[PDB]
Amino acid sequence: ARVMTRGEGVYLWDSEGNKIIDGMAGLWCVNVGYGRKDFAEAARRQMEELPFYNTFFKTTHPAVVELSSLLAEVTPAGFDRVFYTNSGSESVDTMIRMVRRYWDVQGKPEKKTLIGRWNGYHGSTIGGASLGGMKYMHEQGDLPIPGMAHIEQPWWYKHGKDMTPDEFGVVAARWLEEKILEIGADKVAAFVGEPIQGAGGVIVPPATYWPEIERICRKYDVLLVADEVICGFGRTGEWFGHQHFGFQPDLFTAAKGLSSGYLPIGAVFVGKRVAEGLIAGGDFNHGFTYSGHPVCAAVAHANVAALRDEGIVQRVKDDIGPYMQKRWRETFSRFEHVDDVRGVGMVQAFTLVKNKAKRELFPDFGEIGTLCRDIFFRNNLIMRACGDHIVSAPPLVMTRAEVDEMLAVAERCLEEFEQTLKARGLA
Amino acid sequence: ARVMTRGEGVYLWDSEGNKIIDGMAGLWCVNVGYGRKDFAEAARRQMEELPFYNTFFKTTHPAVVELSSLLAEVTPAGFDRVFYTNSGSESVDTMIRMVRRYWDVQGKPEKKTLIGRWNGYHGSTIGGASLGGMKYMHEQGDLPIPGMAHIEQPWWYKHGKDMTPDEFGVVAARWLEEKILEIGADKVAAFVGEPIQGAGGVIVPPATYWPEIERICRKYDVLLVADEVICGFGRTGEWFGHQHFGFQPDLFTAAKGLSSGYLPIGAVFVGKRVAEGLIAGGDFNHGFTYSGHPVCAAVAHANVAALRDEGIVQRVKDDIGPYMQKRWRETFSRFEHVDDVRGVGMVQAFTLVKNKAKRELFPDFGEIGTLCRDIFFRNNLIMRACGDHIVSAPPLVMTRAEVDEMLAVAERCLEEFEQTLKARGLA
């Protein structure tokens, strides 16, 4: 009977008048928060004026031109080429086609294999699911399609053995070199990864990881792609997660965080090297020119402008981010069954564990996470479980009072969670 | 710089006040025509009120519920299960995954091959391009992905030899039986086809074709899938092209015709048998419940309501359709280098040919269509060239005056085109 009635800021309300804290910002994407009535006006105006632009005209729709110009002001130097899509999933599928076409154009038609990671998520298309490494997605299908390979994820809690996180980062990155050499560098087109793995559980790699991944890609002349599905548009305090981790990808993909989810959209941001190679090839020219639904572009422009002009991204970096990260660690580090408390900017997580001292996970990874999640939900807090990882990505506009409000509810729920563990003898 | 400034009804206007006739309704999809300010109000209202619906609630967004209920009132019996997407390309990719999962659930994981047609078009994803039969899309890669096969298209003008269209329909459909038997029925999941091939040049199959295709699919336990990317939402005078051709697909895919292109959207309409088979599996349940961007759904609802309530689809069947078809044939049948004048409802075409009597096509199929297309554009009429086929699919609301206006401009260009052939000695 429970229906959602409205949203404002970080809150949702139901038909019974109950306030719900959205600690996940819809699908990790409602970065400016709920209730942006100004976006509705942007959509209305664009649709009344010119919701279409026909290819009969050799020019680009002014709404799309304006969006691309704003994006160029906020994206790293050298990403003047943007190919618009309808979603993060389509962005990934397009990027796969682009990376393969680039090598064809270069006269290296064998260079077609993309390398991803286990527990990596890259959307839901046949191609994206194949690049992804989600156990259940490959489990129930014909995946992966040819020319896809996977390396283990940089999850220190599980795989670190006796290494420090920094030592482990180097070893985890070197799995890419090992895989490139196993396949043959001349068969490898790209490595693709989320700066922080989102759906996998907010797996935050060690500081040593991305620099070594980047060194390895450059050494073997393999393209480097960041999937900014979740880290894009201010989530880490930088505009894009790759900026936080300090690597410089050749292309990066974006999902509906581009519009804070208010209309469906995505994009592939294409760097100078690949853009020039594809422009010589010619078969993405239609897309580079005529991609982007004008009404969706108008909403995304309003959203990106708000992110910049209202100082929202800067505020994550300098203000609410450090506050959230400190408070997050203060709140959860004391629990007997919580470990690997982690996060940066406005994405954060922890893992529910059987025994901290032994780094021992619960068996049937996910059962305990579901149990904890159900408690959060009963208490009108949205934070999700990915296996036994608990994850949070609230709207970036969250105030310190709202941070503290959310944490107080979560803290109460964790106390309940541990009581239920003990009472069922699983502790 | 020639820029588009506005659209109304069947007309587009440029920056220099020129009135252009859109004989193609955007991407074959602007079915209610341009200037629908009421669609803008629907989008505004939905975005102000509730543009999101969170999975925290186990209910469906009211705008999506309302859209699905309306669609069920106009779609064929048995398609109560709809899975929304952002585009026709995503619909196809989703449909491929569904068809494969359905057989997985039935305990037949070997039944994975989908059969399409040469010159068939099913969107731009890796999966869709592989199912499609566009030669250039394939060799611009290492498509198709595995588990895809193709049969020849039912194009009588080229492949009919000395059969009548109806004899040829049976022959062209039996190519499917041949391919199923070659592969083995136990390895074949589905046959997929556009009721009329759109991008392939409005190839209209003989009346005998679809019933034979259906007989074959049912005999060999192969699913039958209609791609309604272009035939959908009133184009043939029926709601869907499969209804015109009198076949019952097990699933069918839709593109942004669902919203007349005003916002990006698509859908997979899933028949009772496949829906029941998937609901047992459980892994499209999230999509079946939570698919559909609510703002896009509100615009699509307004569009589908207008198509029904303003009598637009019925008018194609009983009124403007017959008129267009009669006038089209009256206008083009007389020309020396025009043959196979064809169409139904508001989709129509012809083929530019070297010699009618010999059914001889121009060499380098495409050069000639382009030169005819160029004349059309110079005279501010948008009709598309697919190889040497000239195609038209105007907004369904086009009036008799506008039909005659359009054909008058087309006639002048064809009168011109043939004069230009001789002057080059290509005639």
UniProtKB/TrEMBL annotation, chains A, B:
Q: Which residues are recorded as binding pyridoxal 5'-phosphate? A: 88-89, 289
- InterPro entries (alphabetical): Aminotrans_3, Aminotrans_3_PPA_site, PyrdxlP-dep_Trfase, PyrdxlP-dep_Trfase_major, PyrdxlP-dep_Trfase_small
| Residues with N6-(pyridoxal phosphate)lysine (covalent) modification | 256
Q: Which PROSITE patterns match?
A: AA_TRANSFER_CLASS_3 (PS00600)
Superkingdom of the organism of origin: Bacteria
Cofactor list? pyridoxal 5'-phosphate
Question: What Enzyme Commission number(s) apply to this enzyme?
Answer: 2.6.1.62
Entry's Gene Ontology molecular function annotations: adenosylmethionine-8-amino-7-oxononanoate transaminase activity; identical protein binding; pyridoxal phosphate binding
* PANTHER family on file: AMINOTRANSFERASE, AMINOTRANSFERASE CLASS-III
Family membership noted in the UniProt record: Belongs to the class-III pyridoxal-phosphate-dependent aminotransferase family.
Q: Write the protein's name.
A: Probable aminotransferase
Give the lineage: Bacteria, Pseudomonadati, Pseudomonadota, Betaproteobacteria, Neisseriales
